[PDB]
Amino acid sequence: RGLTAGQQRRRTIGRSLALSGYVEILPTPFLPAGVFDLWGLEADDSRRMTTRVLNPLEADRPQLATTLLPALLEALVRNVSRGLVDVALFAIAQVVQPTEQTRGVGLIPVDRRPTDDEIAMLDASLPRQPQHVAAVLAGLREPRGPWGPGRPVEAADAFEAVRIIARASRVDVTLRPAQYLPWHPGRCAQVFVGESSVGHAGQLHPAVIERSGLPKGTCAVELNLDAIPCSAPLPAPRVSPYPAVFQDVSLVVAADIPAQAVADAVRAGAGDLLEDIALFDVFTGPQIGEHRKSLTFALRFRAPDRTLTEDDASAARDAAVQSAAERVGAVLRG
Amino acid sequence: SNAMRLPYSWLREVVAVGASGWDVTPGELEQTLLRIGHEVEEVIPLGPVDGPVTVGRVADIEEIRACAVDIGDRQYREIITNFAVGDLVVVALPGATLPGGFTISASDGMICSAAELNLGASGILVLPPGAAEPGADGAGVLGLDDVVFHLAITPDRGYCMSVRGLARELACAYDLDFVDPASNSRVPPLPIEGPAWPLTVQPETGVRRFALRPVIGIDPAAVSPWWLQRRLLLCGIRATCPAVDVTNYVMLELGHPMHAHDRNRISGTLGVRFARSGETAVTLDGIERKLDTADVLIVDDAATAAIGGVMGAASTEVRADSTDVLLEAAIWDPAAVSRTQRRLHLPSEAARRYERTVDPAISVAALDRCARLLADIAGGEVSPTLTDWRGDPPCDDWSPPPIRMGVDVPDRIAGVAYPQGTTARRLAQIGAVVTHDGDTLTVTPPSWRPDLRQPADLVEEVLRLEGLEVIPSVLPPAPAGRGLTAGQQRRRTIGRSLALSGYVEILPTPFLPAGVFDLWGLEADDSRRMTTRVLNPLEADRPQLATTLLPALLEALVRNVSRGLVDVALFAIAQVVQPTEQTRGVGLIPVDRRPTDDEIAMLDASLPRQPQHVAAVLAGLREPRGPWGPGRPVEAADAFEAVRIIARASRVDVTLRPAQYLPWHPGRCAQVFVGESSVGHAGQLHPAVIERSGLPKGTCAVELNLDAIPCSAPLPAPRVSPYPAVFQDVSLVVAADIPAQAVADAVRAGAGDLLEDIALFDVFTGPQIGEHRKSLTFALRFRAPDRTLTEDDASAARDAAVQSAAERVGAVLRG
Amino acid sequence: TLPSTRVPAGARHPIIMLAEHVADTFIAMGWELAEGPEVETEQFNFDALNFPADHPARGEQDTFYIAPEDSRQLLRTHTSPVQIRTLLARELPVYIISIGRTFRTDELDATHTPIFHQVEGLAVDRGLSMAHLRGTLDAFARAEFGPSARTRIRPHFFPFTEPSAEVDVWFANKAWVEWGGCGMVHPNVLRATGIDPDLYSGFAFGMGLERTLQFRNGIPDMRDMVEGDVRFSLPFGVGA
Amino acid sequence: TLPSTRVPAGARHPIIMLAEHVADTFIAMGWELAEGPEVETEQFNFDAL
RNA sequence: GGCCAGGUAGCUCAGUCGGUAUGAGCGUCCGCCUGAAAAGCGGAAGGUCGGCGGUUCGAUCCCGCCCCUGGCCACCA
Ligand SMILES: CS(=O)(=O)NCCNc1ccccc1
Ligand SMILES: [Mg+2]
Ligand SMILES: [Mg+2]
Ligand code: NA
After folding, report:
1. Is the CB of B781 under 7 A from strand E?
2. What residue numbers of B does the annotated binding site for Mg(2+) cover?
3. What values do phi and psi take at A266, rounded to 5?
4. Which CATH number does the domain housing residue B455 bear?
5. CA of residue B40 to ligand 2 center, whole Å
6. Are residues A69 and A212 in the same domain?
7. Which chains touch A (3 or more CB pairs under 8 A)?
8. N or C: which end of chain B has fewer CB within 10 A?
9. Contact C163 B610 (CB under 8 A)
10. At B132, which CATH number?
11. Using CA atoms, how far apart are residues B164 and B253, in angstroms rounded to an integer?
12. What is the pairing mode between strands B3-7 and A292-301?
């Protein structure tokens, strides 16, 4: 039957991240000594529930990895400490997340096949080992050259790494603000496939960067691939031969309102005529009140069976503005 | 022309002779025909009607007409153009609902036609005198409970172009006893008391049999009975007169097309010969035809009588006053009929059956069937004379050669252990003689099955009658394959890389736009102009095949831009057609053997060069706008980067060099090289080409020849040095024409193995730098594999790079 | 939640992706891929495929012919000549599929296209039966239409096969749908390639990709599948 | 000839690519690819073997 | 193959039997407007009216074949 859907997706994710500038490493399961103390995690953090090795090659590294970031950050330090300060790494491997203390199973006689209940018991006594994809970035994201001085790594680069993985998996994700160490609590997005959390991404916390000897502004992302369902979409696009109508709408919202929520509100009210929407301006000048921001979206309307008029398009735009007013309290720019 | 229509009642009638009481659901018969290999196109029921739809006789017409009609029981109703007084017509009295909701009401009704009655195709329906008493039920007289089957007969089953063939097929599928309607053992055949008409046949013309028998003294006022006219209409043939209706009816019944001539308009001996060049013949339809030297004709001492197996002429055409009829039953060459009927566009009911072969053994039997049927309905006298030309020497056995195959061969091919005797029973069921000799059968197919030539043909007969459903689904043992080739794998990598970089793949059309090279402004001797032409293109202004993929991509680019999508990046991976000579084909190679390698190489050499290219086009914004900024428009360097993307996907190194090559901008065009071989071009298109092609401004394009790029399998073995590096920058001033890569190469040549990396990050012109010169600043990273470097150690390698750049590109250290 | 994609991803064509998925299906069953020229000689396009000399498909109405007239050079009406070349060039046994561009005379509308891509399979070995053909078709149908997919074959006619059959497919995602044609390789084709019909048997099959993608995804207008409009390719994702 | 790669291509790990090539080799011969946990019971790592 | 209806702006379509297609909707451009936009308002650009020819000072509109468009009639031993 060939490759499974999960094995095929694992390749597509690797090809996509590598073509986007990331370098794959082979992460080691043995966590660094006191890595969770540097991260400042609470004593009840689920990542601290680790499986420990009785006879490790280094007595200060007995615990198995519940997350891929400590191994990636270790390879990130190795590259930066040796002259390669503009680096983007990624890894696709499993973690070891025990749900209980180390519980063994007695010897089953090997003169027979183990029963299906005995096979299930051996699996339950093992720690959960889901497959994760993770990545770290530091230094310049885009190098300098005859075009300009390049661009440093920012949190949006880690957010784009999520969407690269999402497109490779052919799933739709949403990013929501969250507080989750070791990330920067003001630059940390929680990734959702539907309403199920699959990981986090963004810039790392500056205190974690200081205590770990990391480069300033280091960003990271870790997703649970087993939590992302394998999708097999069968699109049926219908290309309309009729011209489009281009309009822009400028909305003023509170500063805390996510730009995606404004776009979702605009999309919900515009209806089926809305072919494409794109944010291209965020303005917080003096004519905009404090703790508020102006957002301007480029709208593209097109009917499947007729040529529209500006009044037809403005009806969908005004309906979008009303939806934005009801859902995020937007005010038409004036 | 491939259809075959017949009503179910006629088909059941022939089957019921051997299988009394046979009758199946029309849906069940549809599944049986499908299961044995007959594709049905439509199953059309007749009618339906209800209420007062009766048959009546015209009383008298008062003319647009107005006539009273005896609707039976001495009742008269008046309704208000090819009928006189006394004709039996079908009326739709008030209260009736015709097919399609058409309800008739008060003119005391409506005169019905075969159209709205859902019975045929034309005026009004006229029943022959004596068809039905005025006042009978219209549905029962017209037989609207019948069902017409429309079948698409494959060209290997010409014997199924008749009721005889399909009835035999159903008897095979239902394991029924079959009475062939073309046999002698129903009524004894007609007497043979001498020649019927003198004829001469040129043996080199392909005729296998030519029979004649006259019918003398028929009633010219006689009309075909209703049961014969009705069956003709349901099969798609319109009635005319008894002499013609029987020739078409027998053609449908037995599959042997018949033709009726007027015996009083035949002058002398009939002659079958090839047509002379420029010879004409006024056919039966009154249309003059131009004939070819490869066309068979029937002529006498005066004019031409018929086009062999296609259509008869008007010279001997049966007319309304004909009383002496000479019936023709001939077997023409299928290839000669096919060539003739297609040259002058005459898909005749006789021609379609003749090109699919006709059973030669039934020529006299169908002739006697036709002659006796004509005299019965027209009151004629069947002459006991018969001419039966059967080749020279006269052939008396029309059986194909015997075929030998193992008794279990169908079992092996099907993968099913059929019960014993299955093969011999099925082959005898379809009409073949089967004899045994150990485990080997010797099968002689019947004369109406020329398609049965070798054991494979016999296997199909056994399997299709047993049903393909019984064949199990067994996955074969997989061979130990090698997977994808390097080139096939590489085309996936290129497609994945370009798609992830923002390019959208299209399927390019090989038909170039009209005058695309004139829009590009190419010279007359450009190799891309030497195209391959198509003789029958869907657009006459686009006959040439594609020597380059860009015209197809640019056509899709214009389509996207013209519909609101102005920021487009497209690509395509497909072959081109590049001839090195005029269109030259090789002669026919005998198909009864394997062609030698010299013939195979001769076939490949006669074909134009067809290498696989990869190409791409760009327009509008390369990078879209957003909260990050205003975006970036497409520029020439984006096409150069597309080259680098394809090169990294191919794991080969490329070098770009300035070049002048239309349709590219001469100052913004690069020629791509792998080693020292040219593999394509890339850059921005010429502004004159863009203006003349209706392209967006600044359009860029790439096209590479994948077959010119060699496959590579590098085995890198890098050694990571644990020692620190040394960072230094160098600024070199060169002439403006010196490529930046040539300077970087010269720096890398002098720096030696200490140089770990070099990157250009500044191209500076301006007042400090002289005219037609430029300053380049490279970022250097030195690292030793076994030691830590000092600043002087790196400067020595840097100075060696400066000296290398000085003697290779004339660089001067920036001061 | 701000947009972060500075370089929006593109899209490989759905027909190319479907062709790749079909290829991977047969590679996983030990088969291999072969290519051939789109401008083919009439020898390999009709003559070696047991087409009679007066066949209607040899005419100028149903086949793109290369000018001038009677040049015995044309655009291929199927990918079958690719398998004739493989049969001549490779040693037995042969298990190949060919996925290439095919040229027919049909006008471009909502359900037809003159330029379409089809997949053809060819297996020639010792003791290949119709059961092996049916087994391969069922694995082909399951990989493209789901685990509940199954094929149905009805007798038909093709010049290069004997017995011949048309393949119908059943998929529950929305009844039987006409899919393609198949059959045992005609013995005349084997002798035209130097293969003994008494020692080697074989089967072949052929399905169009545009046809398969149409009723599988419910695409209304097939003109959107060949005209290269970006709005049609992008919804199918990148395809890496 | 100026540099045009604003976003430098990365690299998948060679061991991963070698594994992918080995996997494609056997899959081309009808084989299939299986998976398993790195933390395994002693019953399956030793006793069953 | 004898009669029609049709090919008209970037898209989708109206409309004229001779000097202006005062072409529509949408697409493109400028101004007022906005930090920059869009709408709104006020200005514009762009068609050689399917090709090659034949009549006129003048032809998308008037006779002659073709590119390729869906439809009738006619022909159908
Ligand atoms: C609608 S079709 O063009 O795709 N028909 C496919 C027929 N080709 C074929 C190929 C091998 C064996 C049998 C048939
Ligand atoms: Mg069919
Ligand atoms: Mg047969
Ligand atoms: Na440049």
Report:
1. no
2. 451, 457, 460-461
3. -65, -40
4. 3.30.56.10
5. 9
6. yes
7. B, C, D
8. C
9. no
10. 2.40.50.140
11. 6
12. unpaired
The CA-atom distances, in angstroms, between D36 and each of A300, B12, D41, D45 are: 49, 66, 11, 11
Q: What is the domain-level CATH number for residue B266?
A: 3.50.40.10
CB of B606 within 8 A of CB of B626? no
H-state helical runs in chain A: 5-19, 35-38, 69-80, 116-124, 155-169, 206-212, 259-270, 310-328
CB atoms within 10 A of CB B395: 12
- Distance, in angstroms, between D33 CA and closest chain C CA? 11
Residues A279 and A204 grouped into a single domain: no
Domain boundary pick from B442, B470, B498: B470
B383 and B437 co-located in one domain = no
Residues B440 and B517 in one domain: no
Give residue A288's domain range.
Answer: 244-332
Evaluate whether residue B34 is within a structural domain: no
Tell me B192's DSSP state: -
Contact partners, residue B767, CB within 8 Å, separation at least 6: none
Which residues, at least 6 apart from C145, have a Cβ–Cβ distance to it below 8 Å?
C169, C170, C171, C173, C216
- CA–CA gap between residue B592 and residue A27 (Å, rounded): 64
In one-letter notation, the amino acid at residue C141 is A
In angstroms, the separation between the Cα of residue A77 and the nearest Cα of chain C is 26
Cβ of C206 less than 6 Å from ligand 1: yes
Whether residue A262 is contained in a domain is answered as yes
- Treating both helix axes as pointing N-terminal to C-terminal, what angle do A310-328 and A259-270 enclose, rounded to 10 degrees? 130
- The verdict on a CB contact (< 8 Å) between C66 and B556 is no
Specify whether A189 is located in the same domain as A219: yes
Does ligand 1 lie within 6 Å of residue C203's CB atom? no
Domain identity same for A179 and A33? yes
Q: Cα–Cα distance between B135 and B69 in angstroms, integer?
A: 10
D6 → chain A, closest CA residue: A142
- Strand E bases within 7 angstroms of protein beta carbons: 10-12, 24-28, 34-40, 66-70, 75-77
Among A194, A227, A260, the domain-final residue is A227
Maximum separation of any 2 CA atoms in chain A, in Å:
83
Pseudo-torsion of CA A28, A29, A32, A38, nearest 10°? 110
Same domain membership, residue A157 and residue A21:
yes
Resolution of the experimental model, in Å, one decimal: 2.5
For residues A218 and A254, state if they share a domain. Answer: no
CA of residue A303 to C1' of nucleotide E21, angstroms: 27
Q: Do residues B189 and B368 make contact, with C-beta atoms less than 8 angstroms apart? A: yes
Cα gap B155→B160, rounded to integer Å: 10
Residue C176 vs residues A17, B467, B472, C145: alpha-carbon distances, Å? 42, 18, 19, 12
Task: Give the distance, in angstroms, between residue A240 CA and nucleotide E18 C1'.
Answer: 40
CA distance B349 to B1: 9
Q: d(Cα B15, Cα B163) in Å, to the nearest integer?
A: 9
- Per-residue tokens: B326: 């000479």
Q: Which nucleotide is nearest to B558 (CA to C1')?
A: E10
Q: Residue B653 is part of a domain; what is its CATH number?
A: 3.30.930.10
Residues 217-276 of A with CB under 7 A from strand E: 241-250
Q: Nearest to residue A325, comparing CAs of A259, A256, A252, A258?
A: A252
Sign of CA dihedral D26, D32, D38, D44: negative
CATH of the domain at A257: 3.30.70.380
D18-37 b/e with 16+ CB inside 10 Å = b? eebeebbeebbbbeeeeeee
3-state helix, strand, coil in chain A (%, to 5): 30, 30, 45
A234 occurs within a structural domain: no
| Inside any domain, residue B45 | no
How many domains in chain B? 5
Ligand 1 and C81: CB distance under 6 A = no
Atom of ligand 1 nearest to the CA of C207: 4
